[PDB]
Scaffold this active site. Structure first.
Site, mmCIF file in Angstrom:
data_model
loop_
_atom_site.group_PDB
_atom_site.id
_atom_site.type_symbol
_atom_site.label_atom_id
_atom_site.label_comp_id
_atom_site.label_asym_id
_atom_site.label_seq_id
_atom_site.Cartn_x
_atom_site.Cartn_y
_atom_site.Cartn_z
ATOM 1 N N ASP A 94 0.869 -1.180 0.000
ATOM 2 C CA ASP A 94 0.000 0.000 0.000
ATOM 3 C C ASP A 94 0.900 1.223 0.000
ATOM 4 O O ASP A 94 0.585 2.196 -0.651
ATOM 5 C CB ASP A 94 -0.920 0.028 1.211
ATOM 6 C CG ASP A 94 -1.992 1.093 1.326
ATOM 7 O OD1 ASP A 94 -1.740 2.093 2.058
ATOM 8 O OD2 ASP A 94 -3.088 0.868 0.785
ATOM 9 N N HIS A 95 2.057 1.137 0.669
ATOM 10 C CA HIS A 95 2.906 2.291 0.872
ATOM 11 C C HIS A 95 3.811 2.534 -0.337
ATOM 12 O O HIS A 95 4.550 3.511 -0.373
ATOM 13 C CB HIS A 95 3.624 2.111 2.217
ATOM 14 C CG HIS A 95 2.703 2.116 3.394
ATOM 15 N ND1 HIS A 95 3.164 2.098 4.683
ATOM 16 C CD2 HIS A 95 1.351 2.141 3.477
ATOM 17 C CE1 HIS A 95 2.126 2.170 5.516
ATOM 18 N NE2 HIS A 95 1.013 2.178 4.820
ATOM 19 N N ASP A 96 3.742 1.661 -1.352
ATOM 20 C CA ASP A 96 4.333 1.927 -2.666
ATOM 21 C C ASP A 96 3.301 2.639 -3.563
ATOM 22 O O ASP A 96 3.659 3.371 -4.468
ATOM 23 C CB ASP A 96 4.896 0.631 -3.222
ATOM 24 C CG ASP A 96 5.937 0.711 -4.333
ATOM 25 O OD1 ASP A 96 6.083 1.791 -4.954
ATOM 26 O OD2 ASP A 96 6.577 -0.344 -4.615
HETATM 27 C C1 HEM Z 1 0.138 -2.521 11.353
HETATM 28 C C2 HEM Z 1 -0.764 -2.419 10.389
HETATM 29 C C3 HEM Z 1 -1.538 -1.280 9.970
HETATM 30 C C4 HEM Z 1 -1.746 -0.059 10.565
HETATM 31 C C5 HEM Z 1 -1.148 0.426 11.847
HETATM 32 C C6 HEM Z 1 -2.560 0.667 9.733
HETATM 33 C C7 HEM Z 1 -2.993 1.964 9.987
HETATM 34 C C8 HEM Z 1 -3.616 2.788 9.097
HETATM 35 C C9 HEM Z 1 -4.041 4.069 9.313
HETATM 36 C C10 HEM Z 1 -3.983 4.857 10.593
HETATM 37 C C11 HEM Z 1 -4.595 4.523 8.145
HETATM 38 C C12 HEM Z 1 -5.298 5.827 7.947
HETATM 39 C C13 HEM Z 1 -6.779 5.756 8.349
HETATM 40 C C14 HEM Z 1 -7.586 7.052 8.221
HETATM 41 O O1 HEM Z 1 -8.563 7.079 7.408
HETATM 42 O O2 HEM Z 1 -7.238 8.018 8.971
HETATM 43 C C15 HEM Z 1 -4.481 3.522 7.216
HETATM 44 C C16 HEM Z 1 -4.866 3.580 5.886
HETATM 45 C C17 HEM Z 1 -4.583 2.632 4.924
HETATM 46 N N1 HEM Z 1 -4.352 1.347 5.235
HETATM 47 FE FE1 HEM Z 1 -3.792 0.536 6.971
HETATM 48 N N2 HEM Z 1 -2.861 -0.062 8.624
HETATM 49 C C18 HEM Z 1 -2.188 -1.239 8.770
HETATM 50 C C19 HEM Z 1 -2.219 -2.304 7.940
HETATM 51 C C20 HEM Z 1 -2.691 -2.281 6.648
HETATM 52 C C21 HEM Z 1 -2.776 -3.391 5.776
HETATM 53 C C22 HEM Z 1 -2.426 -4.815 6.076
HETATM 54 C C23 HEM Z 1 -3.306 -2.899 4.601
HETATM 55 C C24 HEM Z 1 -3.602 -3.622 3.379
HETATM 56 C C25 HEM Z 1 -3.121 -4.712 2.934
HETATM 57 C C26 HEM Z 1 -3.451 -1.520 4.776
HETATM 58 C C27 HEM Z 1 -3.954 -0.637 3.847
HETATM 59 C C28 HEM Z 1 -4.166 0.714 4.045
HETATM 60 C C29 HEM Z 1 -4.280 1.601 2.995
HETATM 61 C C30 HEM Z 1 -4.102 1.266 1.535
HETATM 62 C C31 HEM Z 1 -4.499 2.807 3.558
HETATM 63 C C32 HEM Z 1 -4.631 4.086 2.801
HETATM 64 C C33 HEM Z 1 -3.334 4.844 2.567
HETATM 65 C C34 HEM Z 1 -3.510 6.292 2.122
HETATM 66 O O3 HEM Z 1 -3.013 7.184 2.861
HETATM 67 O O4 HEM Z 1 -4.078 6.506 1.016
HETATM 68 N N3 HEM Z 1 -3.139 -1.130 6.062
HETATM 69 N N4 HEM Z 1 -3.860 2.452 7.800
HETATM 70 CA CA LIG Z 2 5.254 3.622 -6.043
#
Ligand code: HEM
Ligand SMILES: [Ca+2]
Ligand SMILES: *[C@@H]1O[C@H](CO[C@@H]2O[C@@H](C)[C@@H](O)[C@@H](O)[C@@H]2O)[C@@H](O[C@@H]2O[C@H](CO)[C@@H](O[C@@H]3O[C@H](CO[C@H]4O[C@H](CO)[C@@H](O)[C@H](O)[C@@H]4O)[C@@H](O)[C@H](O[C@H]4O[C@H](CO)[C@@H](O)[C@H](O)[C@@H]4O)[C@H]3NC(C)=O)[C@H](O)[C@H]2NC(C)=O)[C@H](O)[C@H]1NC(C)=O
Ligand SMILES: *[C@@H]1O[C@H](CO[C@@H]2O[C@@H](C)[C@@H](O)[C@@H](O)[C@@H]2O)[C@@H](O[C@@H]2O[C@H](CO)[C@@H](O[C@@H]3O[C@H](CO[C@H]4O[C@H](CO)[C@@H](O)[C@H](O)[C@@H]4O)[C@@H](O)[C@H](O[C@H]4O[C@H](CO)[C@@H](O)[C@H](O)[C@@H]4O)[C@@H]3O)[C@H](O)[C@H]2NC(C)=O)[C@H](O)[C@H]1NC(C)=O
Ligand code: HEM
Ligand SMILES: *[C@@H]1O[C@H](CO)[C@@H](O[C@@H]2O[C@H](CO)[C@@H](O)[C@H](O)[C@H]2NC(C)=O)[C@H](O)[C@H]1NC(C)=O
Ligand SMILES: *[C@@H]1O[C@H](CO)[C@@H](O[C@@H]2O[C@H](CO)[C@@H](O)[C@H](O)[C@H]2NC(C)=O)[C@H](O)[C@H]1NC(C)=O
Ligand SMILES: *[C@@H]1O[C@H](CO)[C@@H](O[C@@H]2O[C@H](CO)[C@@H](O)[C@H](O)[C@H]2NC(C)=O)[C@H](O)[C@H]1NC(C)=O
Ligand SMILES: *[C@@H]1O[C@H](CO)[C@@H](O[C@@H]2O[C@H](CO)[C@@H](O)[C@H](O)[C@H]2NC(C)=O)[C@H](O)[C@H]1NC(C)=O
Ligand SMILES: [Ca+2]
Lengths: 105, 466, 57, 105, 465, 58
Positions: A94-96
């Site tokens: 997701d972070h890519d």
């Molecule tokens: C240790 C695992 C994970 C978190 C800690 C975590 C936390 C977050 C948070 C706080 C957000 C923002 C929420 C908001 O609306 O304020 C968030 C967004 C996204 N996640 Fe999270 N996440 C953890 C783990 C995962 C896993 C396993 C994911 C998918 C396989 C995953 C996805 C995402 C995505 C894509 C986002 C959006 C990113 C953006 O900023 O556009 N996360 N996560």
């Molecule tokens: Ca990228």
């Protein structure tokens, strides 16, 4: 965009030669459907007290969480067929792909 | 109004109200903090609001390298011509590199253990320190870069720093590509959806839009259902590591100190490989460590990640569930009975109807994660449509996709086909026994584990430039 | 904006008399792009940003 | 968005209840393809001298008009099976559909 | 910085540069004026520039009624409760109504004759006066509204001004819808593309986007190929009107005076009905009355509408020809020989390759109007795809589409199915002999002309309360 | 923005002594929406915008 390229830009720019911002950083997301806001264009559903969405009250997100999502955590089901690495790679992936900035205070 | 401490609803703040009879938050005048995402066109009465992606949509290892050119320069070791990434200058992990420390104005890592005074890490993406498991994966890839650069220098001595860096980066990018589309996505989508959404690669198509779609930022948070409520650490016999083998997650968010001082990344990786994921079930969606205690050590209140997900989708103006099913060519249930058929669950259908009134208003993340999973996948047909559709564009619309003619030689392609995430761990850590088969399915020690020696390394012979 | 901790090791190479001249010019150039033109400018920027520079004389 | 109504708004607003700006006046056009600008996002092809489009010089529009469009007016071919009203209704219809504002002076 | 008088290229000006050996403009330091269209997000480094539609996308007769709420009020007669539209209060057309006059900063209509001191007309769209044939169509629909309102009042005496205006507007909109999709579009797209892009209507679809696409603002300029170089006016025997029956267009742009004084709208409409349109031919694309002498009467230099079309395309960031063919499922020619096969013309292919270098950089309007036309249509495959796609979204995505359940009764719909542009002229002008069948195909007097009595009227019986 | 030519005829209805009072209030209301509250304000706006209102004064 240089008509010759060996490596990728850092910003993603010039990947697509016809439309060189596509996929680059600090551009808007693409919309696969027209957006849905309380006022038409800006306000999120839930913003204004008493405003329904498509004829029904907007449910508080924490209520939806409490009533549908919460479960007793000691009863959690381990996945026989997926490691914890399978979740972790998703986050790393997701972070890519996407990071949606918010104002700071 | 500071969205972090105020519960007043004034732009830019969209706080979550508290329901009556909340199991955790007894104070109805309290709220959960939320900043609306930055608009592309701030202040406009004419445009329809839309949010911004601050990263490259491409699978290019931007979380390692940065998505902005200043940052990418700052991530590099500019004291020599070896084409390496900068590494921590204060600490090592039994001889091996750590990510350098970032210099933040308000550093949340320092708050997790006030005595250890260990700040957050610096990486290509800003969230590398959020959980030590994520940090370990960032640390791994950094190390792999420097390994590849070292080896390429050995092999091509005349190459300068810029050349080294670029060729190593190009390889790390392809390694992320291969793991993702060969090993990962098939276990997300399942075979049926994989063949439907990700048919065999042909060639680059300059007419395919490789942007991230707004909806994807919410729908890919499916992975929140896979989150286990502890971080697991294991010793070099894959046995619990003492004193603390199972740390509650609400004590590991932003806890960089744990990587530096509680024994490096080898135990965290062992934990990942030899511990199951949580299974998503219709009555077991997400755990309390993220639904009740998210970031509780570094803010005034614990957050609710599921609820955040749903507030965010509203912030981002996303259509509800049935609009997304129509988009994907799926039936759109009107009645509670029809939602029961689509969910194979009448009880959950009732629960969703009690909250939302119509399936048309179900928030996409909630509807998406409610769907019964596809065979041998871990999303249901709607999420598989969204996620599959996105990753198709990221491949077909990417000029530097690793399989595209002119990116690598045929020889270089054959070499890259050997890579595997287990080997990368072998090559960059003190771990000598790793998962077999698909690292993403292998999960029980020792049944699913092999010695590193059995695994073939990446041969860089075709990178030799006479 | 902010000076990074790992950049302090670059200040060490600049003050190493026996370090390679080309290495020093590559770093000066790095810092000159960030708006820091002399070794004094660089040490002063690290201070502003919270680092301890007392072992610079 | 009144949950009941009999007639159309003047602005076109609320015509689509889910996404109530769609088709309303003083809103942006929808893009069926990603846009193609000299600089990626704003500058028109032909803006900057010596900037090629997809590998070729941009043709002056007046050059294209002179070479391709110009013909002797005495040669004009009447359409046996379309009246002049057929062109006029098109223009009238264009003016039901779109008008793209520009600044003045 | 004043785009009208300077040739400097600085925002918001994007002037057309002059090639060597221009047939008209000898001076290379001259230019053709062009203002870039207003951006949706002024000033932004983050967004991708986009332009604005100032009207309702829907076929709702907004050119009669306005697309902004003040303007709509201003167009109405608020001195009574009969729900009528305002009419000219200074001049009349043999007793019949004319559009009211507008109050503009630099009325261009005033710079046309000057002696006659006749200002521009006021209507729902701002371009009512650009050519008198357009003004006559605006005037017709204005009169038809007031006819309908009068008759509805007579039939429903209890009805107030709001109800009257609204009910009449509903009908005027449905009449534009019917003419457009029943009589016009099939003669633009041809039978094959009509069936493909506009299959028989089913019902409203809240999930169909009814927005106008950027590209449609350029591709629908296909109709610039139909424009003849004269305005034709005819007497009550469909004979040329003296002394000036064939006015060059360079003297008709913004010429509101010709309507008020040179005989009203009846002559112009007769002319439209009995004169053929220009045919698009690959060697006869557009005429010099718009390619060399557009708006000469009201500007410093005459404009090139074709070249404006191609500059606008670029201002709007429209992809080139081949990208639009791929979008529409059409083969994409790379070589001059392949473009020859697509155009049935290796000569035009060569000419386009000499200018553009690749079929990829061909501007949409130019590539579009170059294409051989579809059987019984006046556009080719590309333009038919773009135009067809858009008119489908305006039908299926329109909640107030005339055929959608709940807009009209079965009886009301049955009545509307009899409307015809011919009858509207019969009902709102002094003309007693008009075209038959498809007004858009009928073009020869007397062969293709019938008496008004032979035509059925619109029965407002189903509109009784 | 600008006063319109056809609105002059509305000034005539207001100054018609024998005209219907409901008709006059409809028009007052129309002009009051445009920010013009008195008959003086209406005539003094039309003059600015190029029309002649002397045919309504000395
Ligand atoms: C240790 C695992 C994970 C978190 C800690 C975590 C936390 C977050 C948070 C706080 C957000 C923002 C929420 C908001 O609306 O304020 C968030 C967004 C996204 N996640 Fe999270 N996440 C953890 C783990 C995962 C896993 C396993 C994911 C998918 C396989 C995953 C996805 C995402 C995505 C894509 C986002 C959006 C990113 C953006 O900023 O556009 N996360 N996560
Ligand atoms: Ca990228
Ligand atoms: C390179 O990629 C592009 C991008 O296509 C996408 O690529 C991958 C990501 C795929 O997985 C998939 O996601 C997608 O195909 C390819 O170009 C696309 O090619 C298709 C096929 O021709 C074309 O579809 C056709 O579109 C037209 C135009 O309208 C379309 O767009 C508007 C946009 O709002 C919609 O309203 C509309 O509904 C439609 O989507 C449409 O008229 C066609 O459908 C009509 O004709 C069909 C038969 O000819 C008939 O079956 C149908 O009922 C209609 O009557 C539609 N055709 C089909 C078969 O779907 C895309 O518009 C086009 N888009 C782009 C961006 O170019 C391209 O082929 C590929 N090139 C190579 C070399 O591989
Ligand atoms: C109401 O109208 C809706 C919109 O209709 C469009 O406009 C009208 C005027 C007509 O032209 C109509 O034909 C148009 O479709 C309509 O919803 C639409 O329904 C289609 C068909 O189900 C949906 O297409 C499906 O989309 C998914 C997702 O991919 C799409 O989006 C990506 C990104 O934008 C693109 O890259 C893709 O090309 C698609 O555009 C596809 O996965 C899916 O195709 C796959 O599955 C089918 C079936 O097995 C296979 O045949 C294909 O090869 C693929 O494997 C379809 O392409 C479309 O998204 C949807 N749009 C909206 C707005 O939701 C709706 O059905 C109408 N309702 C009624 C009852 O009239
Ligand atoms: C008497 C007939 C016509 C004109 C006079 C005329 C003039 C113009 C002009 C000046 C433009 C603006 C060009 C620019 O880019 O600056 C213009 C644009 C549009 N046209 Fe034209 N046109 C006459 C005739 C027609 C016919 C018959 C049309 C359709 C079949 C037609 C279409 C259009 C369209 C759709 C536009 C763009 C409108 C917008 O502002 O969005 N025109 N025309
Ligand atoms: C740049 O690379 C050099 C060479 O790898 C790094 O220098 C090493 O740093 C470690 C940790 O401080 C020392 O123990 C070694 O002695 C150094 N090796 C050599 C050859 O000098 C240097 O730290 C890197 N710089 C950054 C910022 O990462
Ligand atoms: C916070 O950080 C401190 C280090 O400053 C941790 O203290 C160490 O804890 C380990 C394990 O209990 C001991 O063996 C070390 O001797 C301690 N070091 C010092 C100098 O105190 C502390 O445990 C951390 N975590 C918590 C839970 O506060
Ligand atoms: C509003 O409608 C009324 C009624 O139709 C118009 O009044 C007529 O105006 C004409 C032209 O000035 C006169 O010859 C008629 O005698 C009037 N009829 C009646 C019965 O009053 C009025 O002109 C319209 N106003 C506008 C601005 O269009
Ligand atoms: C400009 O408008 C004037 C004003 O009507 C036109 O003059 C009239 O022309 C007709 C036909 O020749 C004469 O019968 C009238 O007596 C003229 N009126 C007056 C008062 O001059 C004039 O023809 C127009 N200009 C052009 C070139 O057509
Ligand atoms: Ca309209």
């Amino acid at each position: 965009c240089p008509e010759q390229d060996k490596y990728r830009t850092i910003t993603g720019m010039c990947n697509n030669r016809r439309s060189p911002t596509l996929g680059a950083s600090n551009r808007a997301f693409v919309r696969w459907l027209p957006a849905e806001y309380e006022d038409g264009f800006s306000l999120p559903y839930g913003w204004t007290p008493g405003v329904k969405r498509n004829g029904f009250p907007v449910a508080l997100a924490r209520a939806v969480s409490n009533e549908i999502v919460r479960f007793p955590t000691d009863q959690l089901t381990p996945d026989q067929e997926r490691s914890l690495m399978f979740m972790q790679w998703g986050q790393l992936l997701d972070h890519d792909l996407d990071f949606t900035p918010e104002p700071a205070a | 109004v500071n969205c972090e401490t105020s519960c007043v609803q004034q732009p830019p703040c969209f706080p979550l109200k508290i329901p009556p009879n909340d199991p955790r938050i007894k104070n109805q005048a309290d709220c959960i903090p939320f900043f609306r995402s930055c608009p592309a066109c701030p202040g406009s009465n004419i445009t329809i609001r839309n949010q911004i992606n601050a990263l490259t949509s491409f699978v290019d290892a931007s979380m390692v390298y940065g998505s902005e050119e200043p940052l990418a320069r700052n991530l590099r070791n500019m004291s020599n011509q070896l084409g390496l990434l900068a590494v921590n200058q204060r600490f090592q992990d039994n001889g091996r590199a750590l990510l350098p420390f970032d210099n933040l104005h308000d550093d949340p890592c320092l708050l997790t253990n006030r005595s250890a005074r260990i700040p957050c890490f610096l990486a290509g993406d800003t969230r590398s320190s959020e959980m030590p498991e994520l940090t370990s994966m960032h640390t791994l890839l950094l190390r792999e870069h420097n390994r590849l650069a070292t080896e390429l220098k050995s092999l091509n001595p005349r190459w300068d720093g810029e050349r080294l860096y670029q060729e190593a980066r190009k390889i790390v990018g392809a390694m992320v590509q291969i793991i993702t589309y060969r090993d990962y996505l098939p276990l997300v989508l399942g075979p049926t959806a994989m063949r439907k959404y990700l048919p065999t690669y042909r060639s680059y198509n300059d007419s395919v839009d490789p942007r991230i779609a707004n909806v994807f930022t919410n729908a890919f948070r499916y992975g929140h259902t896979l989150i286990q409520p502890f971080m697991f650490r294991l010793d070099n016999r894959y046995q619990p590591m003492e004193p603390n083998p199972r740390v509650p997650l609400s004590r590991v968010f932003f806890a960089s100190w744990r990587v530096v001082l509680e024994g490096g990344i080898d135990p965290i990786l062992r934990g990942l490989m030899a511990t199951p994921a949580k299974l998503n079930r219709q009555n077991q969606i997400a755990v309390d460590e993220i639904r009740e205690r998210l970031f509780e050590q570094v803010m005034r209140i614990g957050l609710d990640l599921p609820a955040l997900n749903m507030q965010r989708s509203r912030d981002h103006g996303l259509p509800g569930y049935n609009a997304w099913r129509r988009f994907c060519g799926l039936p759109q249930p009107e009645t509670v009975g029809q939602l029961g058929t689509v969910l194979r669950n009448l009880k959950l259908a009732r629960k969703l109807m009690e909250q939302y009134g119509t399936p048309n208003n179900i928030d996409i993340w909630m509807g998406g994660v409610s769907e019964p999973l596809k065979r041998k996948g871990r999303v249901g047909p709607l999420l598989a449509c969204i996620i599959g559709t996105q990753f198709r564009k990221l491949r077909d619309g990417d000029r530097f996709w690793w399989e595209n003619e002119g990116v690598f030689s045929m020889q270089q392609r054959q070499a890259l086909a050997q890579i595997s995430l287990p080997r990368i761990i072998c090559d960059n850590t003190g771990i000598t026994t790793v998962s077999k088969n698909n690292i993403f399915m292998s999960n029980s020690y020792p049944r699913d584990f092999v010695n590193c020696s059995t695994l073939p390394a990446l041969n860089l012979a075709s990178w030799r430039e006479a | 904006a902010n000076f990074l901790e790992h950049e302090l090791s670059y200040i060490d190479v600049l003050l190493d008399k026996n370090a390679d001249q080309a290495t020093k010019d590559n770093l000066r150039s790095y810092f000159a792009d960030k708006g820091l033109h002399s070794i004094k400018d660089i040490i002063n920027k690290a201070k502003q940003d919270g680092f301890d520079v007392s072992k610079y004389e």
